[PDB]
Every structure is written in C-alpha cells, then in structure tokens.
Amino acid sequence: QGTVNWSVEDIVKGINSNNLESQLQATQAARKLLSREKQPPIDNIIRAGLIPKFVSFLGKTDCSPIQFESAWALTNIASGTSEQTKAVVDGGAIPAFISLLASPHAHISEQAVWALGNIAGDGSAFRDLVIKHGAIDPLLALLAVPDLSTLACGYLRNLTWTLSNLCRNKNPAPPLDAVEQILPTLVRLLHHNDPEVLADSCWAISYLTDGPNERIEMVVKKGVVPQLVKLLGATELPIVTPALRAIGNIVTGTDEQTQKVIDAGALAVFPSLLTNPKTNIQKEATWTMSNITAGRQDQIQQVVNHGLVPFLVGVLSKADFKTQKEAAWAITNYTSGGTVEQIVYLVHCGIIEPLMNLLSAKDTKIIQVILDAISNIFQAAEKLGETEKLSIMIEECGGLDKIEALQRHENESVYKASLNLIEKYFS
C-alpha cells in the first residue's frame, strides 16, 4: 500500500528530494506505475524528466535496491515505442546497463540483461549500438558455466531471449564478428532442455539464416542442422515454429546446404508438417518443400522416396489458399528440375485435377505458375508419346475449359501460355 498508485507529481517530488531513501521509494512507485497492465503512463514519466535520474540510480553501487527499481522502471519504458526506447538510450542507459551485467546481485544483472534485450529489440541501429558498447562479452560470460542447468530458469531464458535480439534484424544484418562470437554459446543453448530457451535459440538461428548464403553457411558449419531437425519434431508449437523457419531459411541457400537438411533426416517429419492443423506450420512447410523441389534431381528423388508427392497433392487439393500457392510453387519447381520419370509420377499421384481446380482462382501470379507446370508436364509426357492421355485427363476434369477461357485474360503471359497449350495438345 505504501507505493501503490502514486501520482507522477509525487514520484517527481520524491526523486528530487536529496534523500536517497525517499528517492528509492519514489522510484519503486514509478516502477509499479510502469508495471500495471492498463496503459502505463510511460510518456508522462518521460516528460517529467525522470529518465536521467533513473539512469543515474543505475550507478548507485551501495544502494542495490534503487539499482533494481530504476533498472526495472527503465526496462518498461524501453519496452514501448521506438520513441520511448530512444528516450532510454538518449539518457545514457546502454553503458550503465552493461556495467550492471557484472553485478553480484543476480536479480539486478538479470534486469540489465532484460533492458538490453528491449533496446536491442527495437531495431538494427540500437542493436548494433548495444554491440559497439561491448555488451556481448559480459552477456556471454554469464553463460560461461560447466552446466546451464545450475542457472535459474528465468535467468537463462532472459539471457537467451536477449542474445536472440542481438541476432535479429536485417538491414543491416548483425556484424559478422558479433555473430561469430555469439554462435558457439547459441549452439550450446540449442541443446538445453527448457522449452523456452529452445524456442528462443531456434528464433536466433532463424534470424541468422535469413539472408545471403554466406550467412547460412556460418550457421550450417557449426553443425546445428541435425539438432534443428530434432527440434522440428517437438510437440511444443513454440519450438517447431522457429525450428521450421530456420530449416526453411537454410534450404533457400545452395544445393549443398539444402542437402545437409535432407541428410539430417528432415523429410521424414514432413508428412505430419504438411498436414499440421496450425495453418502457419503447413504454409511454411510447403514453402520449404518448394525450395527443396527447386533442388537437384537427386534431391527431388528424395522427396519422391519419402512419399511427399501425395502430401503435396493433398495440400494442393485442400488447404489454406495461401498454402495452396506454396504447393503450386513446389510443383512448378519440381516440374522444372525433375526427370521425365519424376514428372509423369506427379500425374500418377493425381496432381492434374487439383491443379486444374486452382486455375479458378483470381491471383494472376499462379495461373502463370500452374500453366508453366502443365507446360512442363506436357513436354515430359511428349518424350514418351503420352500427350493424348494427359489431354483427356485435363479435358475430363473441366481443366480444358479453364485453359481456353484463359486466353481472354488481361495478361500477355497468361493468354500466350493458354493459347500455346491449346495448339500442340488440344487440336
């Protein structure tokens, strides 16, 4: 009841009082104001001029509670808009929080970890500014223990989450040397058994692999792909989501980097991923499939062997409409790279009729994707004479009507493929 709902005016009167204990009470009252869930008055606290005082209290080494209270208060200002985070940074909080990482009070260090996570989380400029102030070495030193299990769960989760914000954004991506510094302890967190540490470690890896191939390689050469594939089969949705995002990012790289994903056994998880009831998992799993079917013929062959072509036929036949696109892409890239035997196998699995059904959509971009795929399929059946059988399939499922109704379309690409298709195979 002592510090429950102070007015900002009372907080200001206490913080300006020349009594350190009065300032502590006012700072705790500020922290409780900033901790309530119904619209905490961050902007009023900023306008009263309290941030420099809070930042100054961070250095009060012989009053450890006012360090904690102002650290917590600043953490929650930094949790708001970019403008509010910037107010914390402009008060000089970054070097003061980094000095607090080494505190003998675990709860104070943890709070400095958290506040730096919020600042780094605002974006790449503050992320790189936290890095330039030297935050990475003291953060990583806090994880330099023989066994992470001796650390308190919340502490470890907070360190993992803040390291992942140092890995996060993309224009620009984090400094190469900082990524190299963090990765080894990140690999270690990826083997820790706590669902939240694992999820945030997968998020970090997902950020690091979202870029050019040299960035994927930094991660892939640390050996994490098998562990990512294991995490891909977790029952915790907060784990599979970033695990799948990372795997999907890695298979956007070279054929060789894609192959490590396949070597690691990832394709065996896809029967359940391509039927997963969370539509986002199923969308991203199908996108990931479309970058594997863009690979080599031996890689397309592995998709066949794992029985994933009926699963693509399934997603094409019935799924979220955005997911059906990814499946259309998966098919068209398959048709682009595959052998003739692999391509006619699509027809044997029933690809034709769900492709024709999707010609009824309005998104111009897929009529392209789809008509390309049937162009490639006709072209590969032609090398075995099976052009007629395919033309009657497309005719019997009402796909012929779609293809020819389509050369009155508002696109050069649509109706030159439409009308091309008709002359060699429908006359």
């Binding site: 901790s35 917590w72 953490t75 930094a78 998020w203 979202d210 990012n249 298979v251 956007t252």
Partner: peptide
C-alpha cells in the same frame, strides 16, 4: 530458382510469426 523468406512473406505477411521484440516486466 529459390525464393528467400522476404519473397516468401511478401505475399504472406503481415501475420508471419516471430519471437517477442520487446517485453514488459509485470511481476517480480
């Protein structure tokens, strides 16, 4: 050719999941 996650999520996000960008502390 392969489509990176930015081309992926160009015709998909907003709505694509990510970790927590910022975190408010409400309890001890």
């Amino acid at each position: 050719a392969k489509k990176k996650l930015r081309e992926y999520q160009q015709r998909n996000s907003p709505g694509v999941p990510t970790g927590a960008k910022k975190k408010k502390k409400i309890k001890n």
